[model samples]
Target: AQVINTNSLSLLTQNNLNKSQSALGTAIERLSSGLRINSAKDDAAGQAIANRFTANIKGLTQASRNANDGISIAQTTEGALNEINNNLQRVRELAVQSANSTNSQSDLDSIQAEITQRLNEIDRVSGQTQFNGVKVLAQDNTLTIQVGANDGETIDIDLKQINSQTLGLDTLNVQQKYKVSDTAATVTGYADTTIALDNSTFKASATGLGGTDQKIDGDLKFDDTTGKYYAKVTVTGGTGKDGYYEVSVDKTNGEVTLAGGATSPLTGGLPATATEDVKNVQVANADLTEAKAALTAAGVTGTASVVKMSYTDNNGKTIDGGLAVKVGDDYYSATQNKDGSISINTTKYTADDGTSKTALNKLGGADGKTEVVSIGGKTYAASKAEGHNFKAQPDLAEAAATTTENPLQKIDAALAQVDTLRSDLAAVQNRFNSAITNLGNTVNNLTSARSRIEDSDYATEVSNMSRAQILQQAGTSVLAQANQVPQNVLSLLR
Candidate 1:
């Protein structure tokens, strides 16, 4: 193994030291950065795994924040509904009090004024409640919010309309029961004897029929054979259509048969006597208002329009009473149009008699209590008992195809829906809080795992650096000694 000037041992040792020095430098960089893998060159596989985990941790942190945002919007809806609920409750309380007879007209009117104000408040709140300019109670509204880091992880909420129309609190029947015992024939008509929302029973009385009235409004009938109560002769009625008909529970007879009406055509085998009385009262083919105006216009100073209607209730400031006309079973609201002609609409009136075509001479108001005097033309009976005998309630009930729902009950139902909404939101909020808590733990765990993969172990790296330093010094010293060996050849030359 006689190696001469080639000096292979020294060169090999130097090369080993250089490679060790490079490793030492890398360890020093990792320690300073507090990371084990500074780049792909350091630990390619470990660095890729750490990068993926870091991305997941960031998503989880942001997902928690997004959930909080959803909670805020939900609370806005909850608060708004709460106010509406309170207002509705107050209105319901007033309604119950107004129902009591002990309360004076003054007391009822005051209560009504207050209820009206609060109802308007309900409307205002529903319209204005919002979150960041986004409506919460708008009809058929929906919102979605992300609550998870993964795609398609979201919660959705549905909000329905809470307006007056939707809630059915726009009007109320706050007046005293429509039973007038003290009144005149010129001021005569059937009273609104039906309960506000409960159409289960309705009552009218001829006790207010001014003169010695006989054959009063439609009476109830009892079939002893069947043993049942026919509550009304006809409780047929809508808002502008026939509202409802009332009946007298005090008067019912087995002789008044509601039976035996078969599917006979309009061209029928009916009695001739029945047609004669109906024919006697020829239905007015013209307008009452125009007829009177025409008489004056013609200079017929003594002429008076035969069709007289106390269309307005006494005090006559408001048309609390009107002429509701009936067609078969359906009743319609009768309104004086701009042309002074009567216009029957699909909207029903709560307290008015409706006349039928081809009068039975029984043209009447609610429960047949309204009786038409024979002017030879079927017309609305003059509500002879006109005066503010009793104040009326605000229109709280809806007049649609079906019977109006009680506002008290409707409000309660709406409140239940609101409660459900609040409960759902509260649950979502709790979930968000839990997610944040769990994510805190998860993020820390991921960070620690990543640290092991990519962060420096300072103790190990320092120890390795010291080992490299010693080896590098030794290598330098050996190279110097190896260089002197070449000088040894000079001695041989001497």
Candidate 2:
């Protein structure tokens, strides 16, 4: 073991010193940087696991923010709906006040004016309400919000348009014009020589025998059984088939109905121009090929012309249809009724040039030739004369509003709709709140788990550093002693 050239003990001591130096360097790195896995070489598997946990923690943190944003959106929508609900309640109150018999026409006018202003405000609020520049109330759309750390974890919010038309309040009228008196007497036709009439007797006129100059004596009475006001009169000096007949008065609009169901305008009565208030039939746009196919299937002949058509159902939904066929001199649009019956309506419309035109003029001209006709700002191809299986167009004018269709009922329904919308928004807000809470909890747990795998323990690292320092000092001294072992070979030479 006393070799001069080879110093094995010194070599062993140097190796020990190198290991201690490496250990000290690792302890310093961990202590200073406060991370157990500074590099992948430290603990590759633990580093990978900790990196994934870090990513999840970061993602969850942002997901919680996203959930908060969703909550904000719901709150904004609910706030707008709250104002709408208030306006609806005010409208309902006004409707109730106008329904009272004690209110005069002036009082009703004032009440209606206020109701209109409130409704306008509601519409403005709905139309203008937005969150982050996105319409929240006036559009029908679906918004998806991400609430999870990973993809595909989302909640969809369905937003609906809320306005006067959507709530069926666009045509609301609380002003009462005229109604039948509850105490009016119901009597038969005039059979007696003399009779009396009351103020409730809406009209007293005779027709049939002598026309205008016939001397007729009678009483104006109301028949409760037939819901008509009639003049039971005796005609004299006219012998051409004169007989007593019933007369009915429209209580709502004061239109006079003769005995044979002939309607006439009563003189000095409430304006009976309700017939002039007919809704202009609107035609929806349709594809030409589709219209031709439908007309062909319906047994229509000649060249096919297509036009857009739409009608409101009994449930307030607008059903759009296609197909316009020419029958004789009239053009008729076809639509399906609620009872599964086909309704053929004369297609009458005003052109953009202010010319009044019917389906006949639009479809086929006076010469019965093919031509393009414009109606209601839309152009339609008017083909030649055609025959169809549909019946003659019936009167499609909207019926005048009756006393039974109360505006108060409509206002109540609008209020209920607002309530339902508010409740829905509240539920969605609650969901966002719950998602935020869960996300926060998840982020906390994931952060803790990552810390256990990636964070350095200060106490343990400090102790390791101290042990390495002592070992390194001891190794240096041993290497010095082993170097002196070569000097013992000098002693052998001596």
Model 2 weakest 10-residue run by lDDT: 179-188
Query: Which of the numbered candidates is closest to the native, going by highest lDDT?
Result: 2
Alpha carbon RMSD to native, model 2: 24.6
User: What is the TM-score of each predicted model, taking all chains together?
Assistant: 0.48, 0.50
Cα shift from native, residue 263, model 1 (Å): 83
Encode model 1's per-residue lDDT on 1-494: one tens digit a residue. 44643555655655576576566566556556665334534666666766766876666556565666667766777778888878877877886776677875446557766976787687778767887787777655666766555678776655666766565565543543122221111222111111222222232232222233212133333222222323222222211212112222222221222222211112322222222111011123242343344334434445332222233222433222444433333233344544234433221123323232121222234322234322122232333212211123222222111212464676577567667766876676676676677777778888887766564546875676577667756756676686667557545844
The C-alpha local distance difference test score for the whole of candidate 1 amounts to: 0.47
- The Cα local distance difference test for each model comes to 0.47, 0.53
